[PDB]
DNA sequence: CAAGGCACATGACAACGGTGTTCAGTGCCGCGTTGCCCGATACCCCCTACCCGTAGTTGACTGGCATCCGGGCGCCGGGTCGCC
């Protein structure tokens, strides 16, 4: 919580795992699995 | 000389004269009110032209922005970490 809220938003993005090909195709596979569920 | 007879006029008698008034009827000219006739005007319809909202567009493309000082000036007031 500081001034210039865009900076705090950027930190809120933080460090998250960027997705390579197989990672995201598996994610979409389980996405459609949950959709069918 | 007195009584009885005839003329003219006379107390009323209605009805004309002429003119003024009566109900009434109907108009005769003045003032105001009325049905027409149209004409325009609001108000339904149909047609399409155009404004405005929604939904797609697949090489890849993964963290920015320029701040800010030459007030100036002082106080309040609170926070804030050293201090022993």
């Amino acid at each position: 919580a500081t001034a210039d809220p865009v900076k705090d938003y950027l930190k809120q993005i933080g460090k998250v795992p960027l997705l390579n090909a197989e990672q995201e195709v598996e994610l979409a596979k389980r996405i459609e699995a949950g959709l069918f569920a």
Side-chain angles (χ1 to χ4, degrees):
Chain A
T2 62
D4 292 1
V6 191
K7 278 79 189 178
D8 159 14
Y9 180 64
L10 258 76
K11 309 315 205 319
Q12 181 44 99
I13 294 163
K15 312 301 175 195
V16 284
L18 269 288
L19 314 169
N20 55 30
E22 66 279 15
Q23 148 58 300
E24 52 71 24
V25 312
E26 157 281 349
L27 286 172
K29 276 198 221 85
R30 87 155 169 261
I31 284 269
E32 53 80 14
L35 184 79
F36 303 170

